[PDB]
Design a protein around this ligand. Sequence first.
Ligand SMILES: CCCCCCCCCCCCCCCCCC(=O)O
Ligand SMILES: CCCCCCCCCCCCCCCCCC(=O)O
Ligand SMILES: N[C@@H](CCC(=O)N[C@@H](CS)C(=O)NCC(=O)O)C(=O)O
Ligand SMILES: N[C@@H](CCC(=O)N[C@@H](CS)C(=O)NCC(=O)O)C(=O)O
Ligand SMILES: [Cl-]
Ligand SMILES: [Cl-]
Ligand SMILES: [Cl-]
Ligand SMILES: [Cl-]
Ligand SMILES: [K+]
Ligand SMILES: [K+]
Ligand SMILES: [K+]
Ligand SMILES: [K+]
Ligand SMILES: [K+]
Ligand SMILES: [K+]
Ligand SMILES: [K+]
Ligand SMILES: [K+]
Lengths: 271, 271, 244, 244, 48, 48, 194, 243
Amino acid sequence: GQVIKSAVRSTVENTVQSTHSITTEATPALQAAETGATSNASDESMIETRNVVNTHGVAETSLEAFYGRAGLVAMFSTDGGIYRWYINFGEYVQLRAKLELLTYARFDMEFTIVAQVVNAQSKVQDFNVDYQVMFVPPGASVPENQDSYQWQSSCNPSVISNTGLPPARVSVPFMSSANAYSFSYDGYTQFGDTSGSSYGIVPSNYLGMLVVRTCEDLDGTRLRVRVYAKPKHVKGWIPRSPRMTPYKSRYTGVYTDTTKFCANRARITTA
Amino acid sequence: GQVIKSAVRSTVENTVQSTHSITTEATPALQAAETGATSNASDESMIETRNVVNTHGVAETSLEAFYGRAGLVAMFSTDGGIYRWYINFGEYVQLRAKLELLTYARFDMEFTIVAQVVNAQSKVQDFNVDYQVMFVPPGASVPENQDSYQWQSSCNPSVISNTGLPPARVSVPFMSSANAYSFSYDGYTQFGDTSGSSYGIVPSNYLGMLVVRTCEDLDGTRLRVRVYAKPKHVKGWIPRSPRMTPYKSRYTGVYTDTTKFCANRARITTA
Amino acid sequence: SAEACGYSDRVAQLTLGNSTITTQEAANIVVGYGRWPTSLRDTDATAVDKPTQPGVSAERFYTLPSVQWTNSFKGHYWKLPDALSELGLFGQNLQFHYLYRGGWVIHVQCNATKFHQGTLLVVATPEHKIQSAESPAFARTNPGEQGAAYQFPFTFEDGTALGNALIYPHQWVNLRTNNSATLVLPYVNALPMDSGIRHNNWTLSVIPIVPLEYAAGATTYVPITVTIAPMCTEYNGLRAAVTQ
Amino acid sequence: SAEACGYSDRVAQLTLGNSTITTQEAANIVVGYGRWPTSLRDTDATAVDKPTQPGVSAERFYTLPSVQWTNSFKGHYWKLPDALSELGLFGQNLQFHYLYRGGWVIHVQCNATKFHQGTLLVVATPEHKIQSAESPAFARTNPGEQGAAYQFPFTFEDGTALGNALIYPHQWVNLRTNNSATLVLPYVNALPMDSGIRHNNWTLSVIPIVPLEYAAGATTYVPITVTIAPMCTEYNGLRAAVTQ
Amino acid sequence: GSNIHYTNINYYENAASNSLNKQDFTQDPEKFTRPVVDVMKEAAVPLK
Amino acid sequence: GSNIHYTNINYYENAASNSLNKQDFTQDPEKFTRPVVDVMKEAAVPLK
Amino acid sequence: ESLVEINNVESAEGVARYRIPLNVQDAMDGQIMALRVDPGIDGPMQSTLLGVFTRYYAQWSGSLDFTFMFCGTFMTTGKVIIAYTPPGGDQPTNRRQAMLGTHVVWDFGLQSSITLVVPWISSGHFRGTTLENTIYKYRYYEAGYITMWYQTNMVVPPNFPTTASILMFVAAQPNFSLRILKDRPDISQEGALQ
Amino acid sequence: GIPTLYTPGSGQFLTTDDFQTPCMLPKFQPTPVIDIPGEVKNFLEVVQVESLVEINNVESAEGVARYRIPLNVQDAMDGQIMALRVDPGIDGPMQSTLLGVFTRYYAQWSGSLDFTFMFCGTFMTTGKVIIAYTPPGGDQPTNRRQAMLGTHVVWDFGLQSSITLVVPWISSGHFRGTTLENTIYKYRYYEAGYITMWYQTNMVVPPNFPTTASILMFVAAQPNFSLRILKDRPDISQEGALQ
Ligand SMILES: CCCCCCCCCCCCCCCCCC(=O)O
Ligand SMILES: CCCCCCCCCCCCCCCCCC(=O)O
Ligand SMILES: N[C@@H](CCC(=O)N[C@@H](CS)C(=O)NCC(=O)O)C(=O)O
Ligand SMILES: N[C@@H](CCC(=O)N[C@@H](CS)C(=O)NCC(=O)O)C(=O)O
Ligand SMILES: [Cl-]
Ligand SMILES: [Cl-]
Ligand SMILES: [Cl-]
Ligand SMILES: [Cl-]
Ligand SMILES: [K+]
Ligand SMILES: [K+]
Ligand SMILES: [K+]
Ligand SMILES: [K+]
Ligand SMILES: [K+]
Ligand SMILES: [K+]
Ligand SMILES: [K+]
Ligand SMILES: [K+]
């Protein structure tokens, strides 16, 4: 079972007045990092302190406050009036790096879609057009064209809006077949295959794809789309060592080796 | 009367721990499919099981959850500023196949209309225009032109909106003269006629038509319209064998004979 | 008394099954995330078959081949349960079942003398990916009982900072202070159970952060030994033996 | 009701672990010496280490290779635990431990038709020695999962009368009556536990006493199949795997 | 999953205007799976 | 800071539709900072 | 329960595809059939009731009921073993290997049918309904195999049919459920219907 | 229809907004929450865990060697061993630490800091060093005498291999900016001071022993530490879409 409790606080710890200490008994400053434990020396034991009723809160560092805001996860333009986006958050590094701070996490999500019409030279147009975003779960048929039958969307969820209306937005629940999404997986995607391409990816994190189209054909122009995602009701487990190297691939955590993280200085004795 | 009860559950069945069994009395594994009854052997009787408090829900497979979403039922373009659509769900296969999973069903419906203006080459236009959708019950006069008197719509329900506004939407109650809609009818549409063309269609399922027009004449362009329908408050009876062949006709279930449903494999002994 | 004065005694004895491990220079014992290994709850379980719980036949200490702390030593790591997948009955139960769940007791050993200096970080990392290569080699993702040598210690083989590996359960073997590290690890996963031949829940790393040095003429051959014991294990989905 | 009128129903189901055996032409079930398998009592035990009790991983039905009831068939036999010494986790636990103790559930199968006639004696003999030869061959004393063919059925391979083998737990498979025999056997030995690789406590024999005959033209290929399940097993003295 | 603090107030006259039903239970499938006159216990043989 | 007069009423069926959680506390970090078996008091020496 | 289109081979057309071929053997321990147990993938299960609805969803969970009915003459006897092999490797190659998994030994007699319950044994609470690999790597969810072997042999009297059939049924158990509705891949059209 | 008046802000997409919205799968029922060790509710739990400071960030030090503070037998007294600005969010040795990373995800911080040091020489190697914290106002102390006038601890190498110097929160305001960027914001205003280490006596060793040894430096937030105003971590960037 759990031998270490986790009592909750809503403010940081206060400082209590302390006095001098000349003894052979209590030695707060002496530590032993070898144990694997972080020092337990308090301010009051290292110096003489005053009373400080500290009312500073801890809200902005809660998982909900840290993750509870939208970030870009997809950005693309239609081709032939259609685009197929496989749902995954490895394309854009900012949100990706945030999620990788936890090993496992459960959360609902709010997706927001911002779309505009652009021409061949990628210049934005003031043109209102209806667009459809359809969620195609794995196993369902993905439309090949802008007018394929799958767009009937009688079972697949779809959202139809217009570039002239406010951004489209819908919430999605925690959908994994697992009991938490995994942001680090030391294993393979299947039995009987040990090729590197199938390592480090947990399939249950892939819930399908979003296919987008304009309901009718645009003449010479395309639909530009940005998809934002915002985690909600976050529950997380096992904090991880933060990413310290640039991302190189969308599906793997491969990186370029380095001999330093921070820049060098002239000498260790000059701050 | 009813000799078999139907108690309701909100979660699937739990698994209870079981032990070994060596007897001549209880023989759960032995069955007789000839009776017409599905096996009643439980997991606990076939193998030694552990306790599993299963909290998996059953909500997503309820009739309401299965049918409760919009699907395309009509799609057309005006001609001469008008279009007459006979209300029936056989044109687009996705929703059609879903409904045919039940023999009889009662439900209200939410209709959603999405319309845009397109030119002769079928290219979408950013043009806001007022359009009118009028429900003409059987027996009422159907307008011949975009400006006929029937559009006065003093009795027929009509909905007037604009391609610049959000999709139009209205609910309709369970309107059949019958006590349930029928998705399979082994009979004829009338007495004294046994021609094939009048077989397999129950007239009470046809509540009329939707006639559409632009309130004023478009210059060289047309109105493109999509109609979606979403069943609500569903009550169903007698599950049916699912469609297993492509649909060929809008009004009949005629099909092309086949000698197999799934694709072949090399041999029955290799999975 | 050790618990009376509020300190941790430097001696320790670990007894599991028919095996006993002792050390006279320990530095307390770490219990990962403050949690001891526990059995799967009926409300968390999903697989319905009655599980197999081998007990002492699998929950005991297995000692792996030793590793030499060479001059060029960058570190060494082992994947769990991979490293024991072919040792004793733990290995057999792992091979014969689709599903496995269990905790661990890890004991890393490295003694030198009061004339040597050096420091090893002993860390147990959950879901530790070896992703320094575009296409990771199976020999490095699943090195077996021999374990594998580190090639990129500074970046922890996964693109993070070695110095931040302390966020995971760990201890240090600082030659002037102790000669062993002990870690108790609970089962961690996003699932109640998983396949022991397709997924490694933990990775044990032993990394030299302060190079081994010593008074001129002292013993230069200093081995590092790892002894691991599965704890509170259970298996489901019995069939013929299958290895990765 | 079967127990009400005082008779034995001809159908039966045997469920152990993840295995279930059914028969619709049984002839009751025999419980050797009226005793079901039982665990070793603290007052009978001598080995002091905590035992391993594998449970469902080893206590389940294992089906061995079938044997053909040929025209010249004299009978076939299997030694226990020898026959399963290399099957599943039962075999693994047997190999990894010095000591073993356990019972059995044996199910012999042989179906023909109402147009065939023949009778097989299915007997489980404690300490059955194959001593027809001056120096018994290991291949015959420990035939493994394939079992061995009888060469001297009349003398039961041990110098006694076949007809008196009925003093041991047994049943008959008389084609006109039943197509299977089932025997539950408790552990029997002069010791609380013993080595599973040096001693076979029971020997299962299937001997034709009335030759297989049938209406001209009927199926001539009639197999005999043996399915055996270890029951209430425990092991002591863990070490590396060792086979005889 | 579903909320325990849902506000259900109908703004329209006809029930057809109401939102989707929120029950979603399942029932014993016996009328479809075992529509027989004579009960056949799981422990006994089906026909005798 | 935060309000003491906040109105929390859910308009939708599924909890996934709900607004962000409003707790935001922190807990004793011991399971991460001091995950050791033997308690080591701040006033005494760690190892003895 | 509904019939599995189990004999899906070139030589079998229409109704014959529901029959598992059984015949008098002249060798022992032979195999009769094999099948992946996954209810939503392309194959023998796709046209069953269970398969159709499973194909309307993205995830599933629960034990499965596989029932078999012998259809030979009253005089035809035999014993077969039906086994479920949890995932990890390939389908079992011989009876000895198959026999190590979950199984039932079936004896032909008055009660014409037998049920093999494929218990829910999975790492996660749910499994994806497709095993599509190229894009999603869903082969990760493979649920295992079901195989059938001769336990003894099919035996018949003189001049009797030396071949017989077994019908295979499948259904969901009471602990079965589905999640995430999706369009059934089998229903499609190339143009409006008239 | 209830009379309403829509206001400014209508239709806008504020990334930090918090409204209720229709669910794509209204009747979906998620998998149960199971018992998983290590649940974290607030990242303050993480920054309180000690991590190594990349303190020896000089040209000659590559990789792992950058975590080691060089110590050697002296032939002069009162010499300096190392120096560092204590600010947790600025570029430098602290930026790659746990504390540094999270501090870099925020614009303001407050609280005492824990700097722990572990000596890694041989059991026979002795020594005493003084570690001092110099509150702001001037430049880093030039000699031990000057440094010694501030907050400090005298560390004696022995059985207990480590020592902790608490850099108490001593600031004019309740919070400090996490960057000291000057050119634009003049944030040098928030400099928190320096931490320096000096030989109190000397590192002494027996015959033929290594005359050089190392000290590892750890840092973590104290229980009165907090962060405000989330911002994107400057270290995470990309020049094009990833494939
Ligand atoms: C119909 C409206 C469309 C709106 C979008 C719905 C998207 C549904 C998919 C949600 C799945 C989120 C899973 C997040 C985890 C992915 C992590 C990873 O990339 O590894
Ligand atoms: C005035 C606004 C117009 C909105 C549309 C109203 C439509 C009213 C008709 C509803 C009838 C629905 C019956 C569904 C059954 C048809 C089944 C079939 O095709 O066989
Ligand atoms: N391919 C069609 C034209 C496209 C079309 O009408 N597609 C229909 C039936 S295949 C559809 O399902 N459309 C969905 C939509 O566009 O909303 C043709 O035969 O000309
Ligand atoms: N046909 C008319 C022109 C059309 C017109 O005015 N139609 C009238 C009376 S017939 C009407 O009912 N219009 C309905 C509408 O357009 O809303 C004429 O005589 O020129
Ligand atoms: Cl598939
Ligand atoms: Cl497949
Ligand atoms: Cl800066
Ligand atoms: Cl600066
Ligand atoms: K306080
Ligand atoms: K202390
Ligand atoms: K601290
Ligand atoms: K339940
Ligand atoms: K039965
Ligand atoms: K059933
Ligand atoms: K046990
Ligand atoms: K047990």
